[PDB]
Write a protein that binds this ligand. Structure first.
Ligand SMILES: CCn1c(C(=O)N(C2CC2)C2CC2)cc2c3c(ncn3C)c(NCCCOC)nc21
Length: 285
């Protein structure tokens, strides 16, 4: 286990949903030979937030994959989740900084790792519900990991979807249509979001090219409030989609458009997505 007294604060790493992550050095010998770790806590402690957080901890403790951030432990009320520290941070920030150094085949290596981590979630009947480059972390220049499970839900034993409407700002521009209309989350809604992740990669996180910017442009910037959701629902229903990013090959854009099927059942599987990505990577090599 981990004691509060030996968790030395280094810096704030970020905030997301109702959580906050910080860089600490776990130094029990107080001789500065201790490991640097990532510490997640609730920005505002509440019992509803607490029970969610305890389920989140149980979800991460149960996952062991090369492309999933490692669970290290817990530190006690004022519950904290201890994870490994991934030195290159979010893929979102990393891609922007190394734009000119990261090519298409490297983007596809990352894509492949995201698919393998996501298929592993599916095998446990876990629904991520928040796939985005800001939630993917970089271990090194050749390895990425799904780095947060704040919205992750376990499917009911008898159902392939899970219904949930949480108070607060939902990442609607990554949501499948049935998530916007019916609050239905499944492996297939994660596949939809995965296409948005693949889109994000090929845009190299250019600000004007982000999914909110592109959708708001298509919807109209005059749209405000709960009306934005309505107009987005209508846009997707009429097969309005994110454009092919600049320089993206037609075959990579084809993967994105296939993930963005209004028909939940026609969306590819994470196993098929991995085969397709690996095949394209092999051809490029
Ligand atoms: C990008 C920042 N961020 C967040 C983070 O705020 N998230 C928000 C929900 C709260 C989720 C995980 C994405 C979590 C981590 C993290 C890191 N290493 C291991 N973990 C779990 C790390 N390393 C950053 C290297 C540079 O350090 C100076 N940056 C992180």
């Amino acid at each position: 286990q981990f004691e509060e007294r030996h968790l030395k604060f280094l810096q704030q790493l970020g905030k997301g949903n109702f959580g906050s992550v910080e860089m600490c050095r776990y130094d029990p010998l107080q001789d500065n030979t201790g490991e640097v770790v990532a510490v997640k806590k609730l920005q505002h402690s509440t019992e509803e937030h607490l029970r969610d957080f305890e389920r989140e901890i149980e979800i991460l403790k149960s996952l062991q994959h090369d492309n999933i951030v490692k669970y290290k432990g817990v530190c006690y009320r004022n519950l904290k989740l201890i994870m490994e520290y991934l030195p290159y941070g979010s893929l979102r920030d990393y891609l922007q900084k190394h734009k000119e150094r990261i090519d298409h085949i490297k983007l596809l290596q990352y894509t492949s790792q995201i698919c393998k981590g996501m298929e592993y979630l599916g095998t446990k009947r876990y629904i991520h519900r928040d796939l985005a480059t800001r939630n993917i972390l970089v271990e090194n220049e050749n390895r990425v990991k799904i780095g947060d499970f704040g919205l992750t839900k376990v499917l009911p034993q008898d159902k392939e979807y899970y219904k949930v409407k949480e108070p607060g700002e939902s990442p609607i521009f990554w949501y499948a249509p049935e998530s916007l209309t019916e609050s239905k989350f499944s492996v297939a809604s994660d596949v939809w979001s995965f296409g948005v992740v693949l889109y994000e990669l090929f845009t190299y996180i250019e600000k004007s090219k982000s999914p909110p910017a592109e959708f708001m442009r298509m919807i109209g910037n005059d749209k405000q409030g709960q009306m934005i959701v309505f107009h987005l629902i209508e846009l997707l229903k009429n097969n309005g989609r994110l454009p092919r990013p600049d320089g993206c090959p037609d075959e990579i854009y084809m993967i994105m458009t296939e993930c963005w099927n209004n028909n939940v059942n026609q969306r590819p599987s994470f196993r098929d997505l991995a085969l397709r990505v690996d095949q394209i990577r092999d051809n490029m090599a």
